[PDB]
Amino acid sequence: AALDRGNEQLAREALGQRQSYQSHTEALGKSLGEQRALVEQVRGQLQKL
Amino acid sequence: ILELEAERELLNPPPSPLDKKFEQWEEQQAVEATLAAMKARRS
Amino acid sequence: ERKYLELKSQKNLYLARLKSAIAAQKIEEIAGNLDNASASSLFERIETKILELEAERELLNPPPSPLDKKFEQWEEQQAVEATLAAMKARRS
Amino acid sequence: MELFNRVGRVLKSQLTHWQQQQEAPEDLLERLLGEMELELIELRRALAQTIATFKSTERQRDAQQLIAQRWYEKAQAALDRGNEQLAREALGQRQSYQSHTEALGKSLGEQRALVEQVRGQLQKLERKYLELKSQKNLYLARLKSAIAAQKIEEIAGNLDNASASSLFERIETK
Amino acid sequence: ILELEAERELLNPPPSPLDKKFEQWEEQQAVEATLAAMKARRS
Structure with a gap:
């Protein structure tokens, strides 16, 4: 609702603050997906072993 | 103090004028x- | 008297910068202990140690070949x- | 041997060097991060010391302007009754305090940048410290996994050839 | 006293000028x- 009432200036400031946290989400998000392969493959070894 | 901070510059390379533009230039899209999308989604 | 007090004010300000700098010196001097030829490079040494060990498995236990990747997949096509x-014919 | 006498001549010191190696650099890595926690608070207190001083000068600016305001308070009605001579004397006294206000005022604004930038470093640095700590266990686990996955397949060598499962083939020959 | 309160500012970040506006700006709607709804419900 920040953009409401046609006060876009307030919305721009809030959105700019959002991107700071988004970068962590992207950097953290990719790592979580990458780590999924590691846990699965090691478990595959254990089951086979 | 001047001596020590310079070690950070070499040890940790600082942002470049290009990386000042990349962040700002992509920030323009990022904003x-x-x-x-905001002006189109919640139009 | 004004000069004496005025100087005293700056004493702590740059003792704080000196304290900040030295407290901001050890933190980034430690940062050197992370990245290269240091803990986070030993972090890259252990991975190399990991690389050394797994190769022993490859020699000790030969890995699947690209042919055995095809044999399993190629026969898996029949296996499926x-x-x-038989399924589409038995339970047709 | 020359070297051998040195090892025995200081066995305590040479065993400490071995302790450094057998204490894995990961094991020392843990203690390394402990020292950073000591410094992080030191920077935390060091920064607060800077915060204390700059606003302390802010009150001094407030105090001086209030006195100048007090002189201005007299100037509020000093000019009245057409006795400008009295007003001139009071105004002249005001400028003495104004100079401090200008000199002190500029410093307060300048110091604002210093406190903000140093805090920016702390916020950026604190994230870096925790971020690294997260990876510590992840690869200690891979190191633990690898070493725990090293002995298991190094043992696998003890099975197949010239080993237990070859002695398994020796007994058949027997 | 000045030294101690500053620890709170670092330890507990204070409201920002933006969060002064967010509360006030949304307070306008909140009031x-x-x-x-009041002027429409109990009209």
Whole structure:
């Protein structure tokens, strides 16, 4: 609702603050997906072993 | 103090004038393109 | 008297910068202990140690070949189609 | 041997060097991060010391302007009754305090940048410290996994050839 | 006293000028929009 009432200036400031946290989400998000392969493959070894 | 901080510059390379532009240049999209979805989604 | 007090004010300000700098010196001097030829490079040494060990498995236990990747997949096609061929014919 | 006498001549010191190696650099890595926690608070207190001083000068600016305001308070009605001579004397006294206000005022604004930038470093640095700590266990686990996955397949060598499962083939020959 | 309170500022970050506006700006709705229902419900 920040953009409401046609006060876009307030919305721009809030959105700019959002991107700071988004970068962590992207950097953290990719790592979580990458780590999924590691846990699965090691478990595959254990089951086979 | 001047001696020590310079070690950080070599040890940790500082942002370049290009990386000042990349962040700002992509920030324009990061604010406009993001707000472009805003001005279209919640239009 | 004004000069004496005025100087005293700056004493702590740059003792704080000196304290900040030295407290901001050890933190980034430690940062050197992270990245290169240091803990986070030993972090890259252990991975190399990991690389050394797994190679022993490859020699000690030969890995699947690209042919054995195809044999399993190629026969898997029958193992799924030929098996399902009986399924699509038995339970038709 | 020359070297051998040195090892025995200081065995305590040479065993400490071995302790450094057998204490894995990961094991020392843990203690390394402990020292950073000591410094992080030191920077935390060091920064607060800077915060204390700059606003302390802010009150001094407030105090001086209030006195100048007090002189201005007299100037509020000093000019009245057409006795400008009295007003001139009071105004002249005001400028003495104004100079401090200008000199002190500029410093307060300048110091604002210093406190903000140093805090920016702390916020950026604190994230870096925790971020690294997260990876510590992840690869200690891979190191633990690898070493725990090293002995298991190094043992696998003890099975197949010239080993237990070859002695398994020796007994058959027997 | 000045030294100690600054620890709170670092330890507990204070409200920002933006968060002064967010609360006030949304308070306008929180009073007007809420009262908008009031002036419409109990009209």
